[PDB]
């Protein structure tokens, strides 16, 4: 078994329900037990700003599955919960499901890169993970709680 770590993003189409499905949806994958799951943050969009505010929030997800098989479980859920492609970069959307860290694995394929390639730059995927797993290393060695505790992150409120 691996610990799998997964960010959660919604901002349309009642975030709380997107949210609270997609939790169901995570447990009922296959080989996979959901160990944790962090309080539920209200986040201003980053990147493009016209568009509703994010219900962020992070998992802990146990797992037997290879890496790229819990990938397919997370695009199935996206769009099984209404997620459209739109032609705008970093758009709004119903459900986003990231793989953040998948155990201390390096992964480099062509659907999955592993750790998600910018998480070490945004609170609202940190501070959640924090909540959930405060003695985390990543694969480089780094610790968690000294990256928060060194750059400047925005707080994050509680939805
Ligand atoms: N760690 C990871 N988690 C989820 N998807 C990943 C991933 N690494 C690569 N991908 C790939 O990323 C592709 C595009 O996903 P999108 O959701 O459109 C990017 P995004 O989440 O909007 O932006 P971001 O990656 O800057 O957060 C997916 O089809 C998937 O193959
Ligand atoms: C941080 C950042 C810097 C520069 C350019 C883009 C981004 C995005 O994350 C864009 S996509 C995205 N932006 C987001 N904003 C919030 N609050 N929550 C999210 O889950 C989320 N996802
Ligand atoms: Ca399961
Ligand atoms: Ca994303
Ligand atoms: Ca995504």
Known sequence: MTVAYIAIGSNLASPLEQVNAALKALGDIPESHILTVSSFYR????????????????????????????????????????????????????????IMLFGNEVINTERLTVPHYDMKNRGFMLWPLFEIAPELVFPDGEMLRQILHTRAFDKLNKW
């Open 43 to 98: 986040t201003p969009p980053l990147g493009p700003q016209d568009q509703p505010d994010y219900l962020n929030a992070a998992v802990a997800l146990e797992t037997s599955l290879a890496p790229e098989e819990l990938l397919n479980h997370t695009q199935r859920i996206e769009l099984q919960q209404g997620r459209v492609r739109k032609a705008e970069r970093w758009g709004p959307r119903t459900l986003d499901l990231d």
